[model samples]
Target: SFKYESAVQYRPAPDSYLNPCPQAGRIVKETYTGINGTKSLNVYLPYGYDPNKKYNIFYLMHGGGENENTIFSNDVKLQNILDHAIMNGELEPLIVVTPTFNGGNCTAQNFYQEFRQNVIPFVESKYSTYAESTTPQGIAASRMHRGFGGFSMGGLTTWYVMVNCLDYVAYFMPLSGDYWYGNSPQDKANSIAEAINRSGLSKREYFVFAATGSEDIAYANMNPQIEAMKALPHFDYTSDFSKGNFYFLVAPGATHWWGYVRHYIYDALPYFFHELEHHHHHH
Candidate 1:
């Protein structure tokens, strides 16, 4: 079973302008034979959005034990941040799609599969977004425009998707995620190192930003994962490309709550949107 709280109380903010973008409102229900049963999605379209034009997409996953609306409701200021970014030309106008991460048998596989088959396809069909390509313009355009982020268990899920499905996205922001679940830190670290080595170099430019609060319970475990990574065979050569590709941020006074995430979001947005701007101009 997944470790974390799944139950949460979330209410949409009433002030439309303050919230700016509208909530997905109703659940987007779907089903895939040979996969999970009926699943739901919550999608957010930016204010003054135009469906005619293709927009960048951000797939925001909720933490474990949380529902689709948890991030939208709890992170009430997210829309404001997004609006500010777009208005200032920091990020292209984009869509934020979030889905529920229900914990059950084969939940990880199901979540990943369902996303690939149902959620992503549905979003692409319903809205305008970047299509797959590999040219510098395409790469920069895709990386800057397409992004994913999550917290806690959701964060781990984001990491899983990053390594496994790098082709589908360009930016990865996983906050307070565990590097390994069941095995010793060293074992998990080795596994990740091996995976990184085995995984071919990314075809497109991407950004991976991970963060943990200094006071977070997982704080003690962070360095172990980093150290274990350093201990991996040929760590220097393997990590050379990874250094600039990835980022790690720590907040001294924050915990595992939204506070930590909000801080990191603020820090990362500039870089995140810069990539987006670069992609837009070249494309």
Candidate 2:
């Protein structure tokens, strides 16, 4: 049985200020039915958000040993970061939801399945979000309209979700994730390839931005998975799946701390929201 330990603790910086999104709405909690049982999700909606208008949505996952609040409270200035982006017109105003993958003793497969079947549907039904389409009212209304990203364990979950559930998101950003776990690199590659094939996502529609600090121990461990992806037959040979589709940024002078994740978050926001300005102005 998996042992329960003390919850990890974090203390926010004293000088750090809270720049709540002018649209920061409320923290809503709901119970979702999972394969094993019911799971809970804590969501943060933006202020001035209209349910009638379809808004882009971002699913932010937390690292292992930490709950949903970790990202909002400690690891990164999530609300502030998103608030600044919206206020500055860097990204289209959207909703940011953080869900708990609280599946005890469940394998990664089970965790991801729960996210797909339960958490995602629950959030959609509970909130106002763009539908899964390229229509003006869909995620394709803007490049950043619908995105998913996470840190640490959440990052790994992002990778899995991206490979298996590309239809649900337009962009993916995974920070400091560990990709390869088993013994054989080939085996891992084949598994990932299979998931991608199963999802049947067009190579051109989705963008994946994966980053790790040079000093992070997990960065070194990702080499095998990187090699495996490079060797894949389909995406590897296609021009549509070129370097732009996969952004692997290596942050120098950074470590596996919140500071590093925060830096990448700042760097990623523009890339994540690049197409939104044009979409907003043209329409």
lDDT of 1 by residue, 1-283 (tens): 1111121112222244344433322223333332465566666566567766666777877776677767667553565556655565544567777776673443542465666655676666666666444443443335446778777777777767665555556677777876554378777666655555554544235566667787777667765665665565424311122234554667767788874465566455444533434342431
Off by over 4 Å in 2: 1-25, 104-109, 132-145, 231-243, 273-283
Clashing pairs in 2: 23-46, 23-47, 24-47
TM-score of each: 0.71, 0.76
Model 2: lDDT equals 0.62
On the 0 to 100 scale, the lDDT of residue 186 in model 2 is 74
Top candidate on TM-score is 2
Score residue 182 of candidate 2 by CA lDDT. 60
Candidate 2 local Cα displacement, residue 12, angstroms: 17
Highest lDDT scorer:
2
Show the colliding residue pairs in model 1: 5-65, 6-65
